[PDB]
Design an enzyme around this catalytic site. Structure first.
Site: not given
Ligand code: HEM
Ligand code: M4R
Ligand code: HEM
Ligand code: M4R
Ligand code: H4B
Ligand code: H4B
Ligand code: ZN
Lengths: 410, 415
Positions: A108, A285
Site C-alpha cells: 500500500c 487506480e
Molecule cells: C487513504 C488512502 C489510500 C490510498 C491512496 C491507498 C492506495 C493504495 C493503492 C494505489 C494500492 C494498490 C491497489 C491495486 O493496485 O490493486 C493499495 C493497496 C493496498 N492497500 Fe492502500 N490506500 C489507501 C488506504 C488504505 C487503507 C485505509 C487500508 C486498510 C486499512 C489499505 C490497505 C491496503 C492493502 C492491504 C493493499 C494491498 C492489498 C493486496 O495485497 O492485494 N489502504 N493501496
Molecule cells: C485486479 N486487481 C486485483 C483485484 C488485486 C487485488 C486483490 C485483492 C484481494 N483480495 C485486494 C486488492 O486491493 C487493493 C486495494 C486495497 C485497498 C485499497 C484502499 C483501502 C484504498 C485504495 N485507494 N486502494 C486500495 C486498493 C487488490
C-alpha cells in the site's frame, strides 16, 4: 544483519533493523525470487504464542511492557484460550491491531495515513441484515460528502470455519459486468462472475454500463443475502476533461469510494474474514487499471480515436498519449467535484516521506516495489529509484479464497 | 525445492510451468523471510584448482548436452583434457565453439534483459590474443563499425583475455564504449551528462583535453594485462548519432538534443565455466525509453522535462495536471521518430515487451523456464499497458552469466 536500502536519485541510505522481527514467509528462497508472484505459496496450542506475541507488542507500543496490566492481560488471555479454544480482543487492542495491519501492508502506497483510521467494531453482528446496517453506516461515514475518511468495519472472528462472516463483493461499491451474446462484455469485465451470482440469487439487473452491484452478505456461515445500498449513499463522479469537450460524451463515470471487502484481517492469531476497509483513490487506480486494462473497461481505442491519433503503428505511442489524457480527466473530475483523490506524483512523494518516518521511528518499513511503483510514468516518480525491502509483519491483511468456492448452500 | 513452479499471466490467464529454476547456481539475495528483488546489487584473488574443476565440468556437460553429444567420446575427451589443464596450469582455455556458446547463453540467462528473443543472433569476436591497449582499441573500433553497420545495427560481443592471477586484468574503464561527458561547474551546475562526471574527471586527469560541450563523446580508457590504462579517441566517423526532432512540434529540434545509435555496455564481467572475462564489451540496439525516459528525463541525468513542458505551454503549477507525464510521452515520441527517420534500428517499449512475452513462452516450452526480473523488465513509463506488467516472473541466476564488478579505478594498482 542490518540491511541498507539506497535511493539512487537522492543517494539517501536507510538502515533496516525491523525485518528481524518478521516471522512469516515471503515465498522467495536463496536461489529463487518470487517478488512478482501475486500470491506465493487454528488450535489452542498454535494460538497462544501468536496471542502472546501480539499482546507483547501492544504493551510495548504503549510503553507498559512488563507492567501489572501487561502481566495480567497475558494471564487473562491464556485462561480464555484454555477454556474456549479462542479469545476476544479488548477494544484498544482491536484498534491497535487494525491500524497496524494497514501500517504493515507492504503493497500500500497510502500508508502515510495509517494512524488516521476510523475503526468500527461490529463483532456483535449476527445476521446479514445487521451486516448491511453496519456497512451502510461505514459507507456514509467514509464518504462524508466527498471529504473521504479512512475506515474499517470489523465483523466477528472466525470460529470453527463453518460459521464465517463474509462480504461476497470484492469491493463494497463495484459496477456490474454482463457477458453479451455478442461474446463481448457490457460494463466491468472484472465482475462478470460475481454479477452472474447476483442474478442467479434473484438480483434484477438493469444491464447498463455502470450498474452498482447489490451487497451480497454472509453472516455466521449461512447462505448470503442480497441488499441494495441506498443510492444517496453512493457518491459518483462523471468523468470530463479540462480541454477535450468531447470527453463528457464518452459517458464515463466512477464511484468516489474504494472499499475493499474480500480480504482477511489477522490479529494475534485471530482471523477476521469480513473487514471491509476503505480510503480514497489514487487516480491511476481508475484511470490506468480500471479503464485501460485489456481485461477491464478497455477505453484506450475509443479515446485515441476521438483524439484523432494515428493508431497504425505502436511506435507512435498513441496508447501512451491516450493514457495520460484519461488520467488527467479523472483527476480533474474528482477535484472539480471536491471528492478526495491523490495523483501518483503526490502519493509516491508522500510514501517516500513515510518510509523516512518509519525508518527513523520504527527501524524500517516493509514495501513491495512491484506494487508501490505506479502503473504509469514509473521512473519519473521517486519510488522507482527507491530500493525497498519486502517482508511480512503481523497484524496483517491477507488474501483468502472467494466464498463461492468454499461455501455449501442449502 | 519444488520440482515445478507455476507462473500466471493475469491478463490472459495463461499459466506456465518452470523446471529450469532447479539448475540455479548462484544466490539471489532473497531469503524465506525477506525479499530483495528491488535491491540493485545484492579481494583480488581467483578460483583455486579445487574450485575450478566442478565449475568447468558443469559447463562442459551443459555444452555437450546442447549439441546432442552428451556422454560421447568427444565429451569425455574434452573433460579429461580440461581436467589435466586445470591440474597442471590451475586454469584452462575454452575452445572457440565453447566461447561462442558461453557468450550467447550469458545473454540468454540475463534476467534483466527484455531483448533476449535475439539471444542466438550474436556475433562473437574472439580477442583473447590481445596483449596491449592499442590492440584493445583496434578490436573495439572493429566491433563498433560492425555493430553499427550504417544504422542497421547487429548485436555483438568482443571478448578479451580471461583473468589469470587478478593482477593482469584486461578492463575497459568506460561503462559504455560510447557515452557523453559530464562537467561539474564551480557554481554547482552540470554541463553534459551528469551520470558521467566521475569518469570524465578521470579522463581529464589522464590527459584528455575536454571540449566542454553538452554532447562530447568520451575517449576510451583501456587497460591491458593489468597495466595502467591508456586513452584513445574513437574515430568520429565510427560514432553514429541521431539528432532528436518531433513529427508535430517544429520547435523540438531547437532544443538541440541528439543521442548516439549504439548502446555498448563495457563494464560487466562475463563468467563461463568458472573463467572470468573482465573485459567483454557487448552491444545491441536501443529500446526508446532507455533514451527518452531515463537518459533525458531522470532528475540526475539530462533532466529536460521542464524545458519541454514550457515549450508545450503546459500548466506546471500543480502535479495533478500530469504535465510531467504529458511531456514524457512527447519526448519518447520524438526519440522513436528521429531514429526511424534516420534508419537507425530502435524498438519501442510496446513491441519489445510483446516480443519478450513470446520469447518467454517459447523458453518455457523448449527450455523449461526463463529467468526474468520484473523490476527491470517492465519499462519505466506506461507499465501496465505493456503485457509484461501482468506477467508473473521467476528470477534466478544461471551460468554462464554477465556479472557486476567493481569500478577499476577503485582497485587498480598504479604502476
Ligand atoms: C487513504 C488512502 C489510500 C490510498 C491512496 C491507498 C492506495 C493504495 C493503492 C494505489 C494500492 C494498490 C491497489 C491495486 O493496485 O490493486 C493499495 C493497496 C493496498 N492497500 Fe492502500 N490506500 C489507501 C488506504 C488504505 C487503507 C485505509 C487500508 C486498510 C486499512 C489499505 C490497505 C491496503 C492493502 C492491504 C493493499 C494491498 C492489498 C493486496 O495485497 O492485494 N489502504 N493501496
Ligand atoms: C485486479 N486487481 C486485483 C483485484 C488485486 C487485488 C486483490 C485483492 C484481494 N483480495 C485486494 C486488492 O486491493 C487493493 C486495494 C486495497 C485497498 C485499497 C484502499 C483501502 C484504498 C485504495 N485507494 N486502494 C486500495 C486498493 C487488490
Ligand atoms: C538486441 C537488442 C537489445 C535490447 C533492445 C536490450 C534491451 C535492454 C534493456 C532496455 C535493458 C535494461 C537496461 C537499463 O535499464 O539499464 C537491458 C539490460 C541488459 N541487457 Fe539487454 N538489450 C539488447 C541486447 C543485449 C545484448 C546483445 C546483451 C549481451 C550479449 C544484453 C545483455 C544485457 C544485460 C546483462 C542487462 C542487465 C544489465 C544489468 O544487470 O545492469 N542485452 N537490455
Ligand atoms: C545508471 N544505471 C546503471 C548504468 C545501470 C547499469 C549498470 C551496469 C553495469 N555494470 C550495466 C547496465 O547495462 C544495462 C544494459 C546493458 C546492455 C544493453 C544492451 C546490450 C542493449 C540495450 N539496448 N540496452 C542495454 C542496457 C546498466
Ligand atoms: C530501486 C530500483 O531497484 C532501481 O531504481 C531500478 C528499478 N528498475 C530498473 N529497471 C531498469 N530497466 N533499469 C533500471 O536502472 C532500473 N532501476
Ligand atoms: C504479475 C504482476 O505481479 C501483477 O501484474 C502485479 C504487478 N504490479 C501491480 N501493482 C499494483 N499496484 N497493482 C497490481 O494489481 C499489480 N499487479
Ligand atoms: Zn525475492
Amino acid at each position: 544483519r542490518f540491511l541498507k536500502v539506497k535511493n539512487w536519485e537522492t543517494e539517501v541510505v536507510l538502515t533496516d533493523t525491523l525485518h528481524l522481527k518478521s516471522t512469516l514467509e515471503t515465498g522467495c528462497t536463496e536461489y529463487i525470487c518470487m517478488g512478482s508472484i501475486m500470491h506465493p505459496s487454528a488450535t489452542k496450542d498454535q494460538l497462544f504464542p501468536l496471542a502472546k506475541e501480539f499482546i507483547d507488542q501492544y504493551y510495548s507500543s504503549i510503553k507498559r511492557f512488563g507492567s501489572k496490566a501487561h502481566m495480567e492481560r497475558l494471564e487473562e488471555v491464556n485462561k480464555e484460550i484454555d477454556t474456549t479454544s479462542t479469545y476476544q480482543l479488548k477494544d484498544t487492542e482491536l484498534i491497535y491491531g487494525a491500524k497496524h495491519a494497514w501500517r504493515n501492508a507492504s503493497r500500500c502506497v497510502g500508508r502515510i495515513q495509517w494512524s488516521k483510521l476510523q475503526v468500527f467494531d461490529a463483532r456483535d453482528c449476527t445476521t446479514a441484515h445487521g451486516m448491511f446496517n453496519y456497512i451502510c453506516n461505514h459507507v456514509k461515514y467514509a464518504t462524508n460528502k466527498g471529504n473521504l475518511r479512512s475506515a474499517i468495519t470489523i465483523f466477528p472472528q472466525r470460529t470453527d470455519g463453518k460459521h464465517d462472516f463474509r462480504v461476497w463483493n470484492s469491493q463494497l461499491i463495484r459496477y456490474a459486468g454482463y457477458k453479451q451474446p455478442d461474446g463481448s462484455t457490457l460494463g466491468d469485465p472484472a465482475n462478470v462472475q460475481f454479477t452472474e451470482i447476483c442474478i442467479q440469487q434473484g438480483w434484477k439487473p438493469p444491464r447498463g454500463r455502470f450498474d452498482v452491484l447489490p451487497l451480497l452478505l454472509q453472516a455466521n456461515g449461512n447462505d448470503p443475502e442480497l441488499f441494495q445500498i441506498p443510492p444517496e449513499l453512493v457518491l459518483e463522479v462523471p468523468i470530463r476533461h479540462p480541454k477535450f469537450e468531447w470527453f463528457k460524451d464518452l459517458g464515463l463515470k466512477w464511484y468516489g469510494l474504494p472499499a475493499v471487502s474480500n480480504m482477511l484481517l489477522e490479529i494475534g492469531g485471530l482471523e477476521f474474514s469480513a473487514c471491509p476497509f476503505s480510503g480514497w483513490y489514487m487516480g491511476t487506480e481508475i484511470g490506468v487499471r480500471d479503464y485501460c486494462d485489456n481485461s477491464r473497461y478497455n477505453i484506450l481505442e475509443e479515446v485515441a480515436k476521438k483524439m484523432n491519433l494515428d493508431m497504425r503503428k505502436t511506435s507512435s505511442l498513441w496508447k501512451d498519449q491516450a493514457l495520460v489524457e484519461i488520467n488527467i480527466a479523472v483527476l480533474y473530475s474528482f477535484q472539480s467535484d471536491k471528492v478526495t483523490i491523490v495523483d501518483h506524483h503526490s502519493a509516491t512523494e508522500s510514501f517516500i516521506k513515510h518510509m523516512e518516518n518509519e525508518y527513523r521511528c520504527r527501524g524500517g518499513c516493509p514495501a513491495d516495489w512491484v506494487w508501490i511503483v505506479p502503473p504509469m510514468s514509473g521512473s519519473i516518480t521517486p519510488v522507482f529509484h527507491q530500493e525497498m525491502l519486502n517482508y511480512r509483519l503481523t497484524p496483517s491483511f491477507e488474501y483468502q479464497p472467494d466464498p463461492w468456492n468454499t461455501h455449501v448452500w442449502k
